Structures are given as C-alpha cells and as structure tokens.
C-alpha cells in the first residue's frame, strides 16, 4: 500500500501495467508520468474522509466518497482526479509547474499536479464535467461548487452520506 495526498491507496481488484507517457498541460508544458494502464479498483483512507475509487487508463470511472466535512470530501475528490491522470485535469493547469520548492524539495510530476490543485481547484471542478444521476439509495450528488444534488453531480463522483 502507498500513500498519496494523505490518503492510503489499496488496490482491491483489477490489474495494470506501468507505462511512461509524455503529456501536455494547459500551460503548454510537457511532463513524464507513469501511466498505470488497465482497470483498477482502489480504497482511499484518510483522517477525515474515505472513498472507493474505480479507474481505467487515464480515466476515472467511479468515486464513492464520504467524510466529516464538505472540505474533507473536496480533498478526496481532487486526489482522485489527479490519480486518474485524465486529460481534463492535465489541461486545467494554469501555469508552469515547478519540480523544486523554494526550500529544495524535489517533487515528481504527479505530486506537482496534486499540489497545484490542492492550492486552487476552481478550474479543475469547472472543466471536469457534470452528469445526471438516478435516485439510488445511499448515493447522493455533488456539484462543482460542492452543492449536493439529487439530479446532477460531478462526473463519476457520488457522495455516500
């Protein structure tokens, strides 16, 4: 098990093959990322939030998240979007990403994207995409403005209060 964004990730089902890919950000900057190519299921465990993740090759399929605060749910969603490696998240980067903090702390590209959206995630949520939802027991929706909804939700995100 590995840690990412303060969340503990564990693969429960599926398989993937790591592949290096060169991607282009929204600020026209190149990055070398290790793409886990294949279908996978993960469990995300944090101090204030918990979620179940489903992904494919650079595609988030399903994220069922719970937590104590609306802020703690936002934290889990962002991490899942960055871990998904989707193009909607890469192309939402507004600025060139550094790989070394001011106090010489080297960072890998995936942690570079995580810190960029942990700071400001308005562009990510706006351009991630919304989708209609069906009245399913224990599953509610949430909008790019963290507004709960029983009719729409951020694409693939379903809060389980």
């Amino acid at each position, epitope marked *: 098990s590995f840690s990412f964004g303060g969340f503990t990730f564990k693969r429960t089902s599926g398989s993937s093959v790591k592949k290096e890919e060169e991607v282009l950000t929204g600020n026209l900057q190149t990055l070398k990322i290790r793409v886990h190519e294949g279908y996978e299921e993960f469990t995300m465990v944090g101090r204030r939030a918990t979620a179940i993740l489903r992904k494919a090759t650079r595609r988030l399929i399903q994220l069922i998240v719970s937590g104590r605060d609306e802020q703690s749910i936002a934290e889990a969603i962002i991490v899942a979007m960055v871990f998904s490696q989707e193009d909607c998240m890469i192309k939402a980067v507004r600025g060139d990403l550094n790989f070394v903090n001011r106090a010489n702390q080297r960072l890998n590209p995936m942690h570079q994207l995580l810190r960029h959206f942990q700071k400001d995630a308005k562009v990510l949520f706006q351009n991630w995409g919304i989708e209609p939802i069906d009245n399913v027991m224990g599953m509610i929706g949430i909008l*790019p*403005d963290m507004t*709960p909804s029983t009719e729409m939700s951020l694409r693939g995100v379903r809060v389980s209060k």
Partner: nanobody
Amino acid sequence: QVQLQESGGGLVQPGGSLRLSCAASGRTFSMYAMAWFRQAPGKQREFVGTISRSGDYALHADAVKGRFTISRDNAKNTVYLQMNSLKLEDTAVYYCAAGAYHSKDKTLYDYWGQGTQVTV
C-alpha cells in the same frame, strides 16, 4: 433559520413577462440551495427550477425550460425567477423554497414561502 417571502405577481397578458423575487432573512443564505415551485388551481405543487449554492448550475422543468430562468444574488439574500413568453397555462401560485439539496423533490426542501398569485 431561513424565512421566505415572494413578490412580483399579478395579471399579465399572454406572451408577457414577470420577474418574481424571493427575499430571505436568515443566517447562511449562501449555504442554501433554492428552488421555485408552482401549484395550479386544483393540482399539486409542480417543479419549476432549482439552483446551486453558488448560482452557476441551474436546472428547470421540461415545461418551463427555455422560457424560464432562475437566478440568485447572495449579497442581497434574494433569488429571482424570470418568466418569459408567458402562457394562459402558466396561471398558478408560484412558491419559493430553500433547502440543502438541489433537487426536484418537494419533500427535500425544509423552509418554504407563502406564494404569489400569477394570472395570464
């Protein structure tokens, strides 16, 4: 927490326009999703539209979509309903509601208003 009172109703000609307003007196207006319902004579409440806590994402009914708009100003604690190309069939009492969820279920809204008469 929140009270709701609607205004702006009255008689208009078919094909007219009427912007309804719903003023709120409460603590955290910004943290409340809103909606508009309407009850025609001899019929139950009908969903018109809902709106996000920010105001960015709105959703309307199949019978008013394209002719009606829902908007809110969180600095004045008011949510408005734009009514366009009004029809004789729009004649009903229009209600204002507030709650936690952006929905079509009248039961999910906790705080309701009084209703304003609109006749076309």
